[PDB]
Amino acid sequence: LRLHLLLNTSVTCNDGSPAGYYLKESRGSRRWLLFLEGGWYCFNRENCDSRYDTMRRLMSSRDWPRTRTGTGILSSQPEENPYWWNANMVFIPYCSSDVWSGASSKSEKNEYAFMGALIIQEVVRELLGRGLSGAKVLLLAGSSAGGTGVLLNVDRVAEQLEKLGYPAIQVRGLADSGWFLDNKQYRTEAIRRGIRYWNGVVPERCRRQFQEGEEWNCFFGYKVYPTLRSPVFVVQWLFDEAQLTVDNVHVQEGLRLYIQNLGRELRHTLKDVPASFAPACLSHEIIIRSHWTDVQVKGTSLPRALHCWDRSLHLKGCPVHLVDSCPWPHCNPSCPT
Ligand SMILES: *[C@@H]1O[C@H](CO)[C@@H](O)[C@H](O)[C@H]1NC(C)=O
Ligand SMILES: CC(=O)N1CCC(C#N)CC1
């Protein structure tokens, strides 16, 4: 995939450098895959300054390489990507530190720019002039913070193409490892201070439910998903490492019951999610990993479940809702090592 910096230089990373995207076209294909990178966030000046010292590529484009290798679902080789190997591939680097929700520019009162939501919109606009105008499906995918960003932006991308006069393009979402629980720790406020810092935006219907001061609720999958209109496939490890970090979990009866209860709660939030893939593993992210084809739930791989999803949106032995029921990490033999 080749780097293109955005022609509209007013849409910037944290430090004012232009945002961009990596692209690899496939001219015999009308399918487009836009992937959102992840990588936590920062919610005040002192904490964003620390990020700039040691995580600068997540805050600036000045040191980005000109190319990047497509891996996993972004791979063009059928052996590595049985799902969408012939699609047009786009990798959108995460340089706004706002879980892709911001719409605030750098100015005399703002040390950093938080324009995650505007970066996605500008990428879609400039892609239309490079072949996206002829697409029939646009899959907006992402991992970790990018997976949460899918949930916050998928309906706005569909509305953007509608108002631009492209009603035939079907917009869908693929959220990987971005389905978190606001549960009690083992031993929400950062998000809420972040939204004020970033001038963050959330989907309209969810915003109207929780109203001013409570938009932080829309960052949590099981609360925002029921308000979405576009089809969204949800991939989520039952024992996500980032979820265990924020829960201060690093085995006696107390912790055993805590971990078993966390998997039970996550499984409950997915009962009515018709397109989902939730293995009982302790891990983090999957869809751009090279070995993403190895894990299975009830005998069905993730690339197969995604293909079954495609067929359902036009089934015998081609399932789309796959959630483990065993209650301890790595009770599924296919978990990553
Ligand atoms: C550049 O992006 C900004 C922010 O979204 C927008 O207001 C402006 O209209 C854009 N400029 C052009 C020429 O599209
Ligand atoms: C692993 C990662 O990138 N995360 C975890 C928390 C989540 C929120 N809110 C998005 C950012």
DSSP string, 217-267: GGGSHHHHGGG--S-EEEE--TEEHHHHHHTT----HHHHHHHHHHHHHHH
> 292 C-alpha vs ligand 1 centroid, how far in Å?
38
- Measured in residues, the chain has a length of 337
Residues flanking ligand 2, CB < 6 Å: 38-41, 99, 144-145, 148, 180, 191, 219, 242
Own/partner pairs for 257-261, CB < 8 Å, 24+ apart? Answer: 258/186, 259/328, 259/329, 260/327, 260/328
> 245 C-alpha vs ligand 2 centroid, how far in Å?
10
Mutual angle of helices 116-128 and 145-163, in 10-degree steps? 50
Pocket mutation for ligand 2, best pick of 41, 58, 241, 285 (most atoms within 8 Å of C-beta): 41
- CA pair distance 320, 277, nearest whole angstrom: 8
Ligand 1 pocket residue status of 306, Cβ below 6 Å? no
- Structural domain harbouring 223: 1-337
All residues at 6 or more sequence positions from 311 whose CB lies less than 8 Å from its CB, including other chains? 318
Ligand 1 pocket residue status of 8, Cβ below 6 Å? yes
Q: Where are the alpha helices (DSSP H) in the chain?
A: 45-54, 116-128, 145-163, 189-198, 204-210, 221-224, 241-246, 253-269, 302-312
Pocket mutation for ligand 2, best pick of 55, 180, 191 (most atoms within 8 Å of C-beta): 180
Six-digit token pair at 264? 């039970």
Minimal-distance CA residue to ligand 2 atom 10? 145
- CA pair distance 212, 336, nearest whole angstrom: 42
> Distance between terminal CA atoms of the chain?
29
H helices, E strands: number in the chain: 9, 13
- DSSP annotation string for 73-101: GG---TTT-TTTTTSEEEEE---SSSTT-
Model resolution, angstroms: 1.9
All residues at 6 or more sequence positions from 96 whose CB lies less than 8 Å from its CB, including other chains? 13, 14, 19, 102, 113, 114, 115, 116, 119
Closest-CA residue to 122 (of 144, 166, 153) = 153
Pocket mutation for ligand 1, best pick of 8, 115, 127 (most atoms within 8 Å of C-beta): 8
Six-digit token pair at 207? 């915003």
How many structural domains are present in the chain? 1
Ligand 1 pocket residue status of 10, Cβ below 6 Å? yes
Minimal-distance CA residue to ligand 2 atom 4? 40
| Residue 144 annotated among the catalytic residues of the structure | yes
Cross-strand bridge partners of residue 319: none
Query: Please, what sign has the CA dihedral across residues 303, 306, 311, 312?
Result: positive
Preceding residues of all breaks in the chain (C to N beyond 2.5 angstroms)? 187, 250, 314
Residue type for position 98: D
| Residue 97 annotated among the catalytic residues of the structure | no
The C-alpha angle 21, 23, 28, rounded to 5 degrees, equals 150
